[PDB]
Amino acid sequence: KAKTRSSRAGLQFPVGRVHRLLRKGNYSERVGAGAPVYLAAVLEYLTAEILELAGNAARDNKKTRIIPRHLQLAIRNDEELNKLLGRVTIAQGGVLPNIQAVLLPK
Amino acid sequence: KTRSSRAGLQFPVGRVHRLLRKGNYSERVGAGAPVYLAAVLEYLTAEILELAGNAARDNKKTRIIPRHLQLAIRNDEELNKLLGRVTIAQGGVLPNI
Amino acid sequence: NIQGITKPAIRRLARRGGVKRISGLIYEETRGVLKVFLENVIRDAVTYTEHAKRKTVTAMDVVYALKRQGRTLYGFGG
Amino acid sequence: VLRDNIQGITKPAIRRLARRGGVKRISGLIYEETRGVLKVFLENVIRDAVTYTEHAKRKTVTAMDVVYALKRQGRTLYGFGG
Amino acid sequence: TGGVMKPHRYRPGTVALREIRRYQKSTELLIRKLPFQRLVREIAQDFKTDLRFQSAAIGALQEASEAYLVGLFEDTNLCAIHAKRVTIMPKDIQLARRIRGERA
Amino acid sequence: GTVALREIRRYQKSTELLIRKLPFQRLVREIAQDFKTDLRFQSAAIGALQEASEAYLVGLFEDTNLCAIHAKRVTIMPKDIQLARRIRGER
Amino acid sequence: SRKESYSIYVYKVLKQVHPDTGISSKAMGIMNSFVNDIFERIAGEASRLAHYNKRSTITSREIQTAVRLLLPGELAKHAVSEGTKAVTCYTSAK
Amino acid sequence: ESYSIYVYKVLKQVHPDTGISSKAMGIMNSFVNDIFERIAGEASRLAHYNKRSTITSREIQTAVRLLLPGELAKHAVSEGTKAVTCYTSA
């Protein structure tokens, strides 16, 4: 039985698809064998982190639906994720609630 | 015999073609692309060197200095708009008080 | 139809940013900067479409132009 | 070993750099903040430069790596290759 | 003697802070769709006519423009707070654009 | 006040580097030491770092001067430094 | 013709990390765009960095170095560890 | 490799009596390489978008309009077009 490369490496992301996209995405004539596995693992870990924080942020809101609002909350409330995704605008994500201290009355 | 003489250019068309072929951008490169790219490079370099020579003449100098290149780039709206995120080594800053 | 960006709408946009008070002369300035930004993005999307041999600007051209200006947009097929 | 060397960036040097930028008066607390900013910037550039050297199995940092690294930070440098 | 006592008005800023919280909690588009669509068509008319604009392209443009304006107003609010004021003025807009690099 | 404008006029026309070479060299080596040991450095790499850091600091001081001018002051303060850095996007 | 997407795999990993939580279509679009953008960033950095050393191959080393160049902080280290774990797991099987 | 000779030729074309320092020569080489990289990379990106495998004069032209700003690009486009017909008529 021809087992998938994703099942061989214990990943959920498609190793074959990233291999095809690397080979067809005009980078270099030849692509090493370990590169799609490594890239798929990195993409998996990152999407796992984002979806985890988003599910938690939805959970504080007592919701079972992940919406762009929760994704924006998850991205902007984590320092390193905000550093990585600095220059991206999330559609229908909104803005984090932030009111300045001296803006308030006395 | 040379493509540069056929196109009336001083930049080497073959060099641009070789860089495009071995630069891993696409599988094939048309014949008009290196000629067009070489012409664009020649016009741009002629423009910036013209402004640098004008600035050097205004500064009573015979040799172009990176100070003159910085002055020529920063005094031109289109050029400094193109080169906003570029810092010229040994160029100094534009005099502004 | 630059006057179509009405005063309550731009007031709401400023209010989302946490601004408490608004000067009376600021509205023309915001209309101008919005016009400049829209002009640049629309120009880039239009020449992208003209290179693509099409007569209808699609969302992909817009997202492409925005991402090329360092303003990457998520959620529209990028 | 090198310990507490950032103070080698002297106060008149910061004065000269501010004079180049057109600053007329300088507060006394500017120098420590400027030293901190310079340290942060240098650390950011040096991290990428040393990563580029480590991948190439080299033991010396070359000028090309430093250019490539500042260009990767959006601070393209003309005059040192590229 | 059938008159009614009036509840008077709120202080300046109270309803402002309320609507600040309300708009920072919700995520809908704040610019009306049809005037924005007309404005985009007017700008696009100047280059080449007969250019159709998909609804998704107009929506993407609206989202990007709203994000840009919100970010600019946040920076301008920081500028105003820095100058010991609570009202933003066009000079703060110009300065924010200047330091951002958008204005030469 | 007069010599401040004299210093501005002198330094804005000059092109040589204003940061002293040897302390900057030792600073670069000290920073690079804690990422990897026994690191060598080309002289041109140190010169490129010096030029880039000087250009960045000059730009930061210019934007800080604009911020100081905004608040009806003539003296730059640290709050101007973090205001310029915050607006420019550094953290 | 059809158009490939990462929707099923994103749903699978969400069901792995949060069994009782679903996801809307718009959030699926954002996640797909995010995965695609990160893919382009890492692939382009690896292609450039490989072109610097006059090499024709993207190997695990180029991807690892690109990950260290892009990801900010501890995230990079965690990603690198898991990527190495995946490679040796692949190497341990056949 | 360097572009020294060609920059010397265009310099003596526009300014026969003006010299140039070595640091300015390095600056010119870096500038030409940077502009080449930008235009070629954007043209490749356009080729990738339109599902094309060939870089022709068209994608180069549109990359030139995309990158260079204002009148400059127009004159550059004109110059490139003239070069193409000059190539075609030789």
CSV table of N, CA, C and O in Angstrom, one decimal, chain C residues 1-2 4-6 8-26 29-30 33-39 41-46 49-50 54-60 62-63 66 71 73 76, chain E residues 12-13 16 19-20 23-24 26-28 30-31 35-36 38-40 42-44 47-48 50-54 56-57 59-61 63-70 72-74 77 86-90 93-94 97 100 102:
chain,number,residue,atom,x,y,z
C,1,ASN,N,-17.8,63.4,-6.5
C,1,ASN,CA,-18.5,62.7,-5.4
C,1,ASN,C,-17.6,62.5,-4.2
C,1,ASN,O,-17.8,61.5,-3.4
C,2,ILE,N,-16.5,63.3,-4.1
C,2,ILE,CA,-15.7,63.2,-2.9
C,2,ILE,C,-16.4,63.7,-1.7
C,2,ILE,O,-16.1,63.3,-0.5
C,4,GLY,N,-19.3,62.7,-1.0
C,4,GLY,CA,-20.0,61.6,-0.6
C,4,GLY,C,-19.5,60.9,0.7
C,4,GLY,O,-20.2,60.2,1.4
C,5,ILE,N,-18.2,61.1,1.0
C,5,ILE,CA,-17.6,60.7,2.2
C,5,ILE,C,-18.1,61.7,3.2
C,5,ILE,O,-17.5,62.8,3.4
C,6,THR,N,-19.2,61.5,3.9
C,6,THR,CA,-19.9,62.5,4.6
C,6,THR,C,-19.3,62.7,6.0
C,6,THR,O,-18.4,61.9,6.5
C,8,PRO,N,-20.5,62.6,9.3
C,8,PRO,CA,-20.6,61.6,10.3
C,8,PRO,C,-19.8,60.3,10.0
C,8,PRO,O,-19.3,59.7,11.0
C,9,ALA,N,-19.6,59.9,8.8
C,9,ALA,CA,-18.8,58.8,8.4
C,9,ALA,C,-17.3,58.9,8.8
C,9,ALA,O,-16.7,58.1,9.4
C,10,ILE,N,-16.8,60.1,8.4
C,10,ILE,CA,-15.4,60.3,8.8
C,10,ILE,C,-15.2,60.6,10.3
C,10,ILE,O,-14.2,60.2,10.9
C,11,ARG,N,-16.3,61.1,10.9
C,11,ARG,CA,-16.3,61.2,12.4
C,11,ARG,C,-16.2,59.8,13.0
C,11,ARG,O,-15.5,59.6,14.0
C,12,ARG,N,-17.0,58.9,12.5
C,12,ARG,CA,-17.0,57.5,13.0
C,12,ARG,C,-15.6,56.9,12.8
C,12,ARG,O,-15.1,56.1,13.7
C,13,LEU,N,-15.0,57.1,11.6
C,13,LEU,CA,-13.7,56.5,11.3
C,13,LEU,C,-12.6,57.1,12.3
C,13,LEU,O,-11.8,56.4,12.8
C,14,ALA,N,-12.7,58.4,12.6
C,14,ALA,CA,-11.8,59.0,13.6
C,14,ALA,C,-12.1,58.4,15.0
C,14,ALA,O,-11.2,58.2,15.8
C,15,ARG,N,-13.4,58.1,15.3
C,15,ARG,CA,-13.8,57.6,16.6
C,15,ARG,C,-13.3,56.2,16.8
C,15,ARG,O,-13.0,55.9,18.0
C,16,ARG,N,-13.2,55.4,15.8
C,16,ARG,CA,-12.6,54.1,16.0
C,16,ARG,C,-11.2,54.1,16.4
C,16,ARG,O,-10.7,53.3,17.2
C,17,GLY,N,-10.5,55.2,16.0
C,17,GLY,CA,-9.1,55.3,16.4
C,17,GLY,C,-8.9,55.9,17.8
C,17,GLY,O,-7.7,56.1,18.2
C,18,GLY,N,-10.0,56.1,18.5
C,18,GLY,CA,-9.8,56.6,19.9
C,18,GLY,C,-9.7,58.1,20.0
C,18,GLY,O,-9.2,58.6,21.0
C,19,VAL,N,-10.2,58.9,19.0
C,19,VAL,CA,-10.1,60.3,19.0
C,19,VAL,C,-11.3,60.9,19.7
C,19,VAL,O,-12.4,60.5,19.4
C,20,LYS,N,-11.1,61.8,20.7
C,20,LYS,CA,-12.2,62.4,21.4
C,20,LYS,C,-12.8,63.7,20.8
C,20,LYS,O,-14.0,63.9,20.8
C,21,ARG,N,-11.9,64.6,20.3
C,21,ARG,CA,-12.4,65.8,19.7
C,21,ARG,C,-11.8,66.0,18.3
C,21,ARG,O,-10.7,65.6,18.0
C,22,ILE,N,-12.6,66.6,17.4
C,22,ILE,CA,-12.4,66.7,16.0
C,22,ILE,C,-12.4,68.2,15.6
C,22,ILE,O,-13.3,68.9,15.9
C,23,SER,N,-11.3,68.6,14.9
C,23,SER,CA,-11.3,70.0,14.5
C,23,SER,C,-12.3,70.2,13.3
C,23,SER,O,-12.5,69.2,12.5
C,24,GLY,N,-12.7,71.4,13.0
C,24,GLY,CA,-13.7,71.6,11.9
C,24,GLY,C,-13.0,71.6,10.6
C,24,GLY,O,-13.7,71.4,9.6
C,25,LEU,N,-11.7,71.9,10.5
C,25,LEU,CA,-11.0,71.9,9.3
C,25,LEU,C,-10.4,70.6,8.8
C,25,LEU,O,-9.8,70.5,7.8
C,26,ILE,N,-10.5,69.6,9.7
C,26,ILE,CA,-9.8,68.3,9.4
C,26,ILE,C,-10.4,67.5,8.3
C,26,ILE,O,-9.7,66.8,7.6
C,29,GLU,N,-8.9,67.7,4.9
C,29,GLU,CA,-7.6,67.0,4.9
C,29,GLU,C,-7.8,65.5,4.8
C,29,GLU,O,-7.0,64.8,4.0
C,30,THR,N,-8.7,64.9,5.5
C,30,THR,CA,-9.0,63.5,5.4
C,30,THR,C,-9.5,63.1,4.1
C,30,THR,O,-9.1,62.0,3.6
C,33,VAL,N,-6.3,63.0,1.8
C,33,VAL,CA,-5.4,61.9,1.9
C,33,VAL,C,-6.1,60.6,1.5
C,33,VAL,O,-5.4,59.7,0.9
C,34,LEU,N,-7.4,60.4,1.7
C,34,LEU,CA,-8.1,59.3,1.2
C,34,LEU,C,-8.2,59.2,-0.3
C,34,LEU,O,-8.0,58.2,-0.9
C,35,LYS,N,-8.3,60.4,-0.9
C,35,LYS,CA,-8.3,60.5,-2.4
C,35,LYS,C,-6.9,60.1,-2.9
C,35,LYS,O,-6.8,59.4,-3.9
C,36,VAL,N,-5.8,60.5,-2.2
C,36,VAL,CA,-4.5,60.2,-2.7
C,36,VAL,C,-4.2,58.7,-2.6
C,36,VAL,O,-3.7,58.1,-3.6
C,37,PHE,N,-4.6,58.1,-1.5
C,37,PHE,CA,-4.4,56.7,-1.3
C,37,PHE,C,-5.2,55.8,-2.3
C,37,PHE,O,-4.7,54.9,-2.9
C,38,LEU,N,-6.5,56.2,-2.5
C,38,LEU,CA,-7.3,55.5,-3.4
C,38,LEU,C,-6.8,55.7,-4.9
C,38,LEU,O,-6.9,54.8,-5.7
C,39,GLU,N,-6.3,56.9,-5.2
C,39,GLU,CA,-5.7,57.2,-6.5
C,39,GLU,C,-4.6,56.2,-6.8
C,39,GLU,O,-4.5,55.6,-7.9
C,41,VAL,N,-3.7,53.2,-5.3
C,41,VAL,CA,-4.1,51.8,-5.4
C,41,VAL,C,-4.9,51.5,-6.6
C,41,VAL,O,-4.7,50.5,-7.3
C,42,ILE,N,-5.8,52.4,-7.0
C,42,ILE,CA,-6.7,52.3,-8.2
C,42,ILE,C,-5.8,52.3,-9.5
C,42,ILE,O,-6.0,51.5,-10.4
C,43,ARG,N,-4.8,53.2,-9.5
C,43,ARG,CA,-3.9,53.3,-10.6
C,43,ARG,C,-3.1,51.9,-10.8
C,43,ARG,O,-3.1,51.4,-11.9
C,44,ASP,N,-2.6,51.4,-9.7
C,44,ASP,CA,-1.8,50.1,-9.8
C,44,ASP,C,-2.7,49.0,-10.2
C,44,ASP,O,-2.4,48.1,-11.0
C,45,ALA,N,-4.0,48.9,-9.7
C,45,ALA,CA,-4.9,47.9,-10.1
C,45,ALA,C,-5.3,48.0,-11.5
C,45,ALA,O,-5.4,47.0,-12.2
C,46,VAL,N,-5.5,49.2,-12.0
C,46,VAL,CA,-5.8,49.4,-13.4
C,46,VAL,C,-4.7,49.0,-14.4
C,46,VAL,O,-5.0,48.3,-15.4
C,49,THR,N,-4.7,45.2,-14.5
C,49,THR,CA,-5.8,44.7,-15.3
C,49,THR,C,-5.4,44.9,-16.8
C,49,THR,O,-5.7,44.0,-17.6
C,50,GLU,N,-4.9,46.0,-17.2
C,50,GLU,CA,-4.5,46.3,-18.6
C,50,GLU,C,-3.4,45.3,-19.0
C,50,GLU,O,-3.4,44.9,-20.2
C,54,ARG,N,-7.6,42.2,-19.8
C,54,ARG,CA,-9.0,42.1,-19.3
C,54,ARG,C,-9.7,43.5,-19.4
C,54,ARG,O,-9.0,44.5,-19.4
C,55,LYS,N,-11.0,43.5,-19.3
C,55,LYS,CA,-11.8,44.7,-19.3
C,55,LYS,C,-12.5,44.9,-17.9
C,55,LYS,O,-13.1,45.9,-17.7
C,56,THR,N,-12.4,43.9,-17.0
C,56,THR,CA,-13.0,44.0,-15.7
C,56,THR,C,-11.9,43.8,-14.6
C,56,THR,O,-11.2,42.8,-14.6
C,57,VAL,N,-11.9,44.8,-13.7
C,57,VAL,CA,-10.9,44.7,-12.6
C,57,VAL,C,-11.5,43.7,-11.6
C,57,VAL,O,-12.6,43.9,-11.0
C,58,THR,N,-10.7,42.7,-11.2
C,58,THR,CA,-11.0,41.7,-10.2
C,58,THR,C,-10.4,42.0,-8.9
C,58,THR,O,-9.5,42.9,-8.8
C,59,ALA,N,-10.9,41.3,-7.9
C,59,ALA,CA,-10.3,41.5,-6.5
C,59,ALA,C,-8.8,41.1,-6.4
C,59,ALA,O,-8.1,41.7,-5.6
C,60,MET,N,-8.4,40.2,-7.2
C,60,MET,CA,-7.0,39.7,-7.2
C,60,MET,C,-6.0,40.8,-7.6
C,60,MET,O,-5.0,41.0,-7.0
C,62,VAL,N,-6.6,44.0,-7.1
C,62,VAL,CA,-6.6,45.0,-6.0
C,62,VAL,C,-5.7,44.4,-4.8
C,62,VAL,O,-4.9,45.2,-4.3
C,63,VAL,N,-5.8,43.2,-4.5
C,63,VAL,CA,-5.0,42.6,-3.4
C,63,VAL,C,-3.6,42.5,-3.8
C,63,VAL,O,-2.7,42.8,-3.0
C,66,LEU,N,-2.2,46.2,-3.5
C,66,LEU,CA,-2.0,46.5,-2.1
C,66,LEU,C,-0.9,45.8,-1.5
C,66,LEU,O,-0.1,46.4,-0.7
C,71,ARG,N,0.9,46.7,2.0
C,71,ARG,CA,-0.4,46.8,2.7
C,71,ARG,C,-1.2,45.5,2.5
C,71,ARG,O,-2.3,45.5,2.0
C,73,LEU,N,-3.4,42.3,2.4
C,73,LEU,CA,-4.8,42.2,2.8
C,73,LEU,C,-5.1,40.7,2.9
C,73,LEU,O,-4.9,40.0,1.9
C,76,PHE,N,-9.4,37.8,1.0
C,76,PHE,CA,-10.0,38.0,-0.4
C,76,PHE,C,-9.3,37.1,-1.4
C,76,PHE,O,-9.2,37.5,-2.5
E,12,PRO,N,-19.7,67.3,27.3
E,12,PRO,CA,-18.9,67.0,26.1
E,12,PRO,C,-17.8,66.0,26.4
E,12,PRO,O,-16.9,66.2,27.3
E,13,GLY,N,-17.8,64.8,25.7
E,13,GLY,CA,-16.9,63.7,25.9
E,13,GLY,C,-17.6,62.5,26.4
E,13,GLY,O,-17.0,61.4,26.1
E,16,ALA,N,-19.1,60.9,23.6
E,16,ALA,CA,-18.0,60.6,22.8
E,16,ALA,C,-17.3,59.3,23.2
E,16,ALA,O,-17.0,58.4,22.4
E,19,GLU,N,-19.6,56.2,22.4
E,19,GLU,CA,-19.5,55.8,21.0
E,19,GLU,C,-18.1,55.3,20.6
E,19,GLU,O,-18.0,54.5,19.7
E,20,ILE,N,-17.1,55.8,21.3
E,20,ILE,CA,-15.7,55.2,21.2
E,20,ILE,C,-15.8,53.7,21.5
E,20,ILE,O,-15.3,52.9,20.7
E,23,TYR,N,-18.0,51.7,18.9
E,23,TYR,CA,-17.4,51.5,17.6
E,23,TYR,C,-16.1,50.7,17.7
E,23,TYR,O,-15.7,50.0,16.7
E,24,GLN,N,-15.4,50.7,18.8
E,24,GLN,CA,-14.2,49.8,18.9
E,24,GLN,C,-14.6,48.4,19.3
E,24,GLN,O,-13.8,47.5,19.1
E,26,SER,N,-17.5,46.9,17.8
E,26,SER,CA,-18.1,46.4,16.6
E,26,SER,C,-17.2,46.5,15.4
E,26,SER,O,-16.2,47.3,15.4
E,27,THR,N,-17.5,45.7,14.3
E,27,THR,CA,-16.6,45.6,13.2
E,27,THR,C,-17.2,45.9,11.8
E,27,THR,O,-16.5,45.6,10.8
E,28,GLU,N,-18.4,46.5,11.7
E,28,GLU,CA,-19.0,46.7,10.4
E,28,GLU,C,-18.3,47.9,9.7
E,28,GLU,O,-17.5,48.6,10.3
E,30,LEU,N,-17.8,51.4,8.0
E,30,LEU,CA,-18.3,52.7,8.5
E,30,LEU,C,-18.6,53.7,7.4
E,30,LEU,O,-19.3,54.6,7.6
E,31,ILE,N,-18.0,53.4,6.2
E,31,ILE,CA,-18.3,54.2,5.0
E,31,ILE,C,-19.4,53.6,4.3
E,31,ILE,O,-19.5,52.4,4.1
E,35,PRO,N,-21.8,55.7,-2.0
E,35,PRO,CA,-20.8,56.8,-2.3
E,35,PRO,C,-19.4,56.3,-2.5
E,35,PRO,O,-18.7,56.9,-3.3
E,36,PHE,N,-18.9,55.3,-1.8
E,36,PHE,CA,-17.6,54.8,-2.0
E,36,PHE,C,-17.4,54.2,-3.3
E,36,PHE,O,-16.4,54.4,-4.0
E,38,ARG,N,-19.2,55.0,-6.0
E,38,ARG,CA,-19.2,56.1,-7.0
E,38,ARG,C,-17.8,56.8,-7.0
E,38,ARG,O,-17.3,57.2,-8.1
E,39,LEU,N,-17.2,57.0,-5.8
E,39,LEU,CA,-15.9,57.7,-5.8
E,39,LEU,C,-14.8,56.8,-6.5
E,39,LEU,O,-14.0,57.4,-7.2
E,40,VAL,N,-14.8,55.5,-6.2
E,40,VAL,CA,-13.9,54.6,-6.9
E,40,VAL,C,-14.1,54.7,-8.4
E,40,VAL,O,-13.1,54.7,-9.2
E,42,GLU,N,-15.3,57.2,-10.1
E,42,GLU,CA,-14.8,58.5,-10.6
E,42,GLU,C,-13.3,58.6,-10.7
E,42,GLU,O,-12.8,59.2,-11.6
E,43,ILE,N,-12.6,58.0,-9.7
E,43,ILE,CA,-11.1,57.9,-9.8
E,43,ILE,C,-10.7,57.0,-11.0
E,43,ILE,O,-9.8,57.4,-11.7
E,44,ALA,N,-11.3,55.9,-11.2
E,44,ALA,CA,-11.0,55.0,-12.2
E,44,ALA,C,-11.3,55.5,-13.6
E,44,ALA,O,-10.7,55.1,-14.6
E,47,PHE,N,-8.4,57.2,-16.1
E,47,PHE,CA,-7.3,56.5,-16.8
E,47,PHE,C,-7.8,55.8,-18.1
E,47,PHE,O,-7.3,56.1,-19.2
E,48,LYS,N,-8.9,55.1,-18.1
E,48,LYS,CA,-9.5,54.4,-19.3
E,48,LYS,C,-10.9,54.0,-18.9
E,48,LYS,O,-11.1,53.3,-17.8
E,50,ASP,N,-14.9,52.2,-19.6
E,50,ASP,CA,-15.4,50.9,-19.8
E,50,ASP,C,-14.7,49.9,-18.9
E,50,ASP,O,-14.4,48.7,-19.4
E,51,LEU,N,-14.4,50.2,-17.7
E,51,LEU,CA,-13.7,49.3,-16.8
E,51,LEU,C,-14.7,48.9,-15.7
E,51,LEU,O,-15.1,49.6,-14.8
E,52,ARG,N,-15.1,47.6,-15.8
E,52,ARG,CA,-16.0,47.0,-14.8
E,52,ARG,C,-15.3,46.7,-13.5
E,52,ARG,O,-14.2,46.3,-13.5
E,53,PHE,N,-16.0,46.9,-12.4
E,53,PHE,CA,-15.4,46.7,-11.1
E,53,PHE,C,-16.3,45.8,-10.3
E,53,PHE,O,-17.4,46.1,-9.8
E,54,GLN,N,-15.8,44.5,-10.1
E,54,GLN,CA,-16.4,43.5,-9.3
E,54,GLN,C,-16.7,44.0,-7.9
E,54,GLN,O,-16.0,44.8,-7.4
E,56,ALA,N,-16.4,42.4,-5.2
E,56,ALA,CA,-15.4,42.0,-4.3
E,56,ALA,C,-14.2,42.9,-4.4
E,56,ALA,O,-13.6,43.2,-3.3
E,57,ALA,N,-13.9,43.5,-5.5
E,57,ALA,CA,-12.8,44.5,-5.6
E,57,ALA,C,-13.2,45.7,-4.9
E,57,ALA,O,-12.3,46.3,-4.2
E,59,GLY,N,-15.2,46.0,-2.4
E,59,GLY,CA,-15.2,45.6,-0.9
E,59,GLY,C,-13.8,45.6,-0.4
E,59,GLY,O,-13.5,46.0,0.7
E,60,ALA,N,-12.8,45.0,-1.2
E,60,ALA,CA,-11.4,45.0,-0.7
E,60,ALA,C,-10.9,46.4,-0.7
E,60,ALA,O,-10.1,46.7,0.3
E,61,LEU,N,-11.2,47.2,-1.6
E,61,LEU,CA,-10.7,48.6,-1.6
E,61,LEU,C,-11.3,49.3,-0.4
E,61,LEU,O,-10.6,50.1,0.2
E,63,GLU,N,-12.2,48.0,2.5
E,63,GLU,CA,-11.6,47.5,3.7
E,63,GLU,C,-10.2,48.1,3.9
E,63,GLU,O,-9.8,48.5,5.0
E,64,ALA,N,-9.4,48.1,2.8
E,64,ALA,CA,-8.1,48.7,2.8
E,64,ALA,C,-8.1,50.2,3.2
E,64,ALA,O,-7.3,50.7,4.0
E,65,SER,N,-9.0,50.9,2.6
E,65,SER,CA,-9.1,52.4,2.9
E,65,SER,C,-9.5,52.6,4.3
E,65,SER,O,-9.0,53.6,5.0
E,66,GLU,N,-10.5,51.8,4.9
E,66,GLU,CA,-10.8,52.0,6.3
E,66,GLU,C,-9.7,51.7,7.2
E,66,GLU,O,-9.5,52.4,8.2
E,67,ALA,N,-8.9,50.6,6.9
E,67,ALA,CA,-7.8,50.3,7.7
E,67,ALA,C,-6.7,51.4,7.7
E,67,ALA,O,-6.2,51.7,8.8
E,68,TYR,N,-6.4,51.9,6.5
E,68,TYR,CA,-5.5,53.0,6.4
E,68,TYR,C,-5.9,54.2,7.2
E,68,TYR,O,-5.1,54.8,7.9
E,69,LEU,N,-7.2,54.6,7.1
E,69,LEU,CA,-7.7,55.8,7.8
E,69,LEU,C,-7.7,55.6,9.3
E,69,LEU,O,-7.4,56.5,10.0
E,70,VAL,N,-8.0,54.4,9.8
E,70,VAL,CA,-8.0,54.1,11.2
E,70,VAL,C,-6.6,54.2,11.7
E,70,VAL,O,-6.3,54.8,12.8
E,72,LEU,N,-4.1,55.9,10.5
E,72,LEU,CA,-3.7,57.3,10.4
E,72,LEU,C,-4.3,58.1,11.6
E,72,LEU,O,-3.6,59.0,12.1
E,73,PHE,N,-5.5,57.8,11.9
E,73,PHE,CA,-6.1,58.5,13.0
E,73,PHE,C,-5.5,58.1,14.4
E,73,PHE,O,-5.4,58.9,15.3
E,74,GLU,N,-5.1,56.9,14.5
E,74,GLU,CA,-4.4,56.4,15.7
E,74,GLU,C,-3.1,57.2,15.9
E,74,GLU,O,-2.7,57.7,17.0
E,77,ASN,N,-3.8,60.8,16.7
E,77,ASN,CA,-4.2,60.9,18.1
E,77,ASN,C,-3.0,60.9,19.0
E,77,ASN,O,-2.9,61.6,20.0
E,86,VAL,N,-6.3,67.5,23.1
E,86,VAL,CA,-7.2,66.4,22.9
E,86,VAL,C,-7.9,66.5,21.6
E,86,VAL,O,-8.6,65.6,21.2
E,87,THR,N,-7.7,67.6,20.8
E,87,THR,CA,-8.3,67.8,19.5
E,87,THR,C,-7.3,67.7,18.5
E,87,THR,O,-6.2,68.4,18.5
E,88,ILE,N,-7.5,66.9,17.5
E,88,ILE,CA,-6.6,66.7,16.4
E,88,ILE,C,-6.8,67.8,15.4
E,88,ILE,O,-7.9,68.3,15.2
E,89,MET,N,-5.7,68.3,14.8
E,89,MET,CA,-5.7,69.4,13.8
E,89,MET,C,-5.0,68.9,12.5
E,89,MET,O,-4.4,67.8,12.6
E,90,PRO,N,-5.3,69.6,11.4
E,90,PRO,CA,-4.6,69.1,10.2
E,90,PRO,C,-3.0,69.1,10.3
E,90,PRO,O,-2.4,68.4,9.5
E,93,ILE,N,-2.1,65.7,11.2
E,93,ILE,CA,-2.2,64.9,10.1
E,93,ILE,C,-1.0,65.0,9.2
E,93,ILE,O,-0.4,63.9,8.8
E,94,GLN,N,-0.6,66.2,8.9
E,94,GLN,CA,0.6,66.4,8.0
E,94,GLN,C,1.9,65.9,8.6
E,94,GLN,O,2.7,65.3,7.9
E,97,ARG,N,1.9,62.0,8.5
E,97,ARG,CA,2.2,61.6,7.2
E,97,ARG,C,3.7,61.8,6.9
E,97,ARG,O,4.3,61.0,6.1
E,100,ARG,N,5.7,59.2,8.7
E,100,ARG,CA,5.5,57.9,8.1
E,100,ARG,C,6.2,57.7,6.8
E,100,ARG,O,6.3,56.6,6.3
E,102,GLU,N,5.0,58.9,3.9
E,102,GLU,CA,4.0,59.0,2.9
E,102,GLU,C,4.1,60.4,2.2
E,102,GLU,O,3.9,60.5,0.9
